[PDB]
Amino acid sequence: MPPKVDPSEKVEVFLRVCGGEAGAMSTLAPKLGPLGVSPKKVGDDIAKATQPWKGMKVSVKLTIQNRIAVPEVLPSASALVIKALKEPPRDRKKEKNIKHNGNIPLEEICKIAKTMRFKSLAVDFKGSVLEILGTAHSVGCKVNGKSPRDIQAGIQSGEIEVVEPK
Amino acid sequence: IEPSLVILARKYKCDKMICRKCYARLHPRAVNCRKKKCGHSNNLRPKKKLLK
Amino acid sequence: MKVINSSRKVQIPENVTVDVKGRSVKVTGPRGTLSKSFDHASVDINLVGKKELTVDLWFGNRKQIACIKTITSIIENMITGVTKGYEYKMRFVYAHFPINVAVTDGGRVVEIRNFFGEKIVRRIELLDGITCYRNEKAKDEIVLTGNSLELLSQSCATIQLRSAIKYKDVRKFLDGIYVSERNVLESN
Amino acid sequence: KQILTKGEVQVSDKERHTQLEQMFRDIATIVADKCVNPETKRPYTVILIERAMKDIHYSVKTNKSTKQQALEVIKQLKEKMKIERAHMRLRFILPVNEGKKLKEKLKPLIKVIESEDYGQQLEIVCLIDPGCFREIDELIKKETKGKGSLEVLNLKDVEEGDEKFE
Amino acid sequence: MSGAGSKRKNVFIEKATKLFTTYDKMIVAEADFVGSSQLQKIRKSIRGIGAVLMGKKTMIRKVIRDLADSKPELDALNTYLKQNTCIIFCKDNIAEVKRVINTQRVGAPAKAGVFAPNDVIIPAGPTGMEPTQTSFLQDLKIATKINRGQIDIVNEVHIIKTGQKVGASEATLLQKLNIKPFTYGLEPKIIYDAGACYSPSISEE
RNA sequence: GACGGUGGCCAUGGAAGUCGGUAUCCGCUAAGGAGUGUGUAACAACUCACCUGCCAAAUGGACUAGCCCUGAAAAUGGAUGA
């Protein structure tokens, strides 16, 4: 994960759809990049600056450019990183074909990813965060060893990591 | 200003349920024809939108 | 059928005076005087004092019962009109030819020369009592005004229906003079 | 039963009429499958083709197949005139917004190849169709779109159709 | 019959009577314009200290609880028979609830037919009117005047309060321009006690 | 009023509730479908389910069978006998 940084200097807002391997089949939106002063190739690069290997399709990620250059931007969705780290490999050659999520421990990842989008989302932190993100991806399971919203309802993780990302 | 005018125009001409056993122009809440040829009926469809 | 109807009452403001004789009312107000007849069976239509006019119906059918309310509504309308008159703002529109409308209060008539490039001077006389006046906002409207709603609306309708090309597609054009604001009443 | 099985069909009054029609039908069908006007590869109407085939003279048969007869017909006019017995390839230049509808009409109608779709650029497709179908293609794009459509030849001609000899 | 239908009413009864005797202080707020985006920031600050509990016209189902407490429902300031209400509950912070409720307000233009906040100024003058939007003004039956070198209907003062419907034209005008008349959200009517009124006085600060 | 996770996960010029595939859960709630259409490259915006204020006593529906209407067009003029 890059360090979470605020917008400063010139601010060019971009909405990159993918970012594990950026545009393979022009999977990034080709209208949005050149409209905000950034070539297609250039856009491809800076897609991977936000999330190099965790970037999946249908992203809510913000690629900001301070003085038309990457400031090591973080802010991305909870849903992306979480899904990504269940079965780690996420480029654009494994994301052109269907794939099943891994059944591995993911409790410590969700708390960090919860407030990766924003600091405050106007919802209950430390109480039902694992209940939300343990079943955000209804297909498959978070971890097969435990049961979502039964052994994770009372059991919560985080205290500084749940409200602010690392 | 201009769109308002257009919508007004539509209001009296285009937005009316147009029957079926009859082709009588009714009104957007219609569930009958009010014609004793149609037999009142409950075959109301919307009047179609513009197409070039 | 034959249930016995209750009354339908309509309030009367102290500005106006409502007469009634032989099941046929006459509101008189500051603005003018409207008159209307109502012909039905056992429809006692009376005055309580000068605050409530009552309409009744002893042993009404469903049909008979329905019309009582209508009657009441019509008298309410009359009451409204004779104390604070109805105003119908009509906007006219077409997407190329500017529709040339001009009023003649001497004749009590609206005339429309252009509308679809039709070289006829399409005119019709406004109903008795009501008038139009050439109000401008960018050469877009005409505002009809009157005592009687029934007449006023008819007038509006006449110039609406006339103002419309009657050949080929109805959706493609916007030609016509249509009623925009009808709920508004002239200010006193 | 025997008569039905081994016997041949005989024309009654109704059937005589049908017979007359039949010849007309056959000529209409067999001749109009594959051809273009001399000088360049362009589509052209059936009447002209019919005239051409009459000039050289042809007698249709119900004992032969229609497809078979088509080949025969074209044989005559390959010697006489310059004609196209095979397919051609087209290239359309579609807009991004208005072209989707057009594409959906074309896709089940004929084979689409070299389909290059872009957001920042105009959509490009290429077809495989007979010489008489170009007109059909171009026409349906214009009335559906409500604007002009650029028709370009990808190739003037291409193999297969009645050139592979079915 | 009763205590049935889609998403049952009986359920709501449990919330509006049994949890109406488990808090020290209360505040009767007004929710006739605030959204859900605005309101969920006032269901975190309030939720931590107490709750926002009301089934809406379930104060008449509170009469079983009024046997011991003797709570005012129609007797307090605002009889609650003309406006929507949502009772704010609090026990940890009874002092720091009356002002943090007003901090989460968000300003915006008026709407067609809305009940409206306390203050509603209509746009007028050079800043509050455009030259292109004079046509609209002309269309209206009300008079138009030239004030400060601009054609306007002229009204820059309060003509409506809480529980009085704004005009359609006015609303439209508000929407069109960048004029936001007042900041609004959950607005306290009065401060409220268990079996009494603590302060029958408005507090928008 | 119709929100947060969230543009869930699939797939791709673009499909971000709303061309389409599968699951369709939780937070905060009086209540808000991983969404009923209008719309948009896709969005945004609008609309609906859903919830509630105002008003104040009945209301909504799916059937049943009486008469009546539609279904129901023919040649001299016209037949409940008039």
Swiss-Prot record, chain A:
The keyword Ribosomal protein applies. It holds the Pfam family Ribosomal_L11_N. The keyword Metal-binding does not apply. One of its GO terms (molecular function) is structural constituent of ribosome. One of its GO terms (biological process) is translation. This is Large ribosomal subunit protein uL11. One of its GO terms (cellular component) is cytosolic large ribosomal subunit. Belongs to the universal ribosomal protein uL11 family. Keywords: Ribonucleoprotein, Ribosomal protein. It comes from the Eukaryota.
Curated annotation (Swiss-Prot), chain B:
It is found in: Cytoplasm. It comes from the Eukaryota. Component of the 60S subunit of the ribosome. Part of the 60S ribosomal subunit. This is Large ribosomal subunit protein eL40. It comes from Dictyostelium discoideum (Social amoeba). The lineage of its organism: Eukaryota, Amoebozoa, Evosea, Eumycetozoa, Dictyostelia. The chain holds residues 77 to 128 of 128 of the full protein.
Curated annotation (Swiss-Prot), chain C:
Pfam families: Ribosomal_L6 (PF00347). It comes from the Eukaryota. The gene is rpl9. The keyword Chaperone does not apply. The keyword Ribonucleoprotein applies. Keywords: Ribonucleoprotein, Ribosomal protein. This is Large ribosomal subunit protein uL6. GO terms for cellular component: cytosolic large ribosomal subunit; extracellular matrix; phagocytic vesicle. GO terms for molecular function: rRNA binding; structural constituent of ribosome. GO terms for biological process: cytoplasmic translation. Belongs to the universal ribosomal protein uL6 family.
Swiss-Prot record, chain D:
GO terms for biological process: bone marrow development; bone mineralization; cytosolic ribosome assembly; hematopoietic progenitor cell differentiation; inner cell mass cell proliferation; leukocyte chemotaxis; mitotic spindle organization; rRNA processing. GO terms for cellular component: cytoplasm; cytosol; nucleolus; nucleoplasm; nucleus; spindle pole. It comes from the Eukaryota. Widely expressed. GO terms for molecular function: microtubule binding; ribosome binding; RNA binding; rRNA binding. Changing R42T: In SDS1; strongly reduced release of EIF6 from pre-60S ribosome subunits. Keywords: Acetylation, Cytoplasm, Cytoskeleton, Disease variant, Nucleus, Ribosome biogenesis. It is found in: Cytoplasm; Nucleus, Nucleolus; Nucleus, Nucleoplasm; Cytoplasm, Cytoskeleton, Spindle. Belongs to the SDO1/SBDS family. Associates with the 60S ribosomal subunit. Interacts with NPM1, RPA1 and PRKDC. May interact with NIP7. Found in a complex consisting of the 60S ribosomal subunit, SBDS and EFL1. Interacts with EFL1. Interacts with CLN3. This is Ribosome maturation protein SBDS. The lineage of its organism: Eukaryota, Metazoa, Chordata, Craniata, Vertebrata. The chain holds residues 85 to 250 of 250 of the full protein.
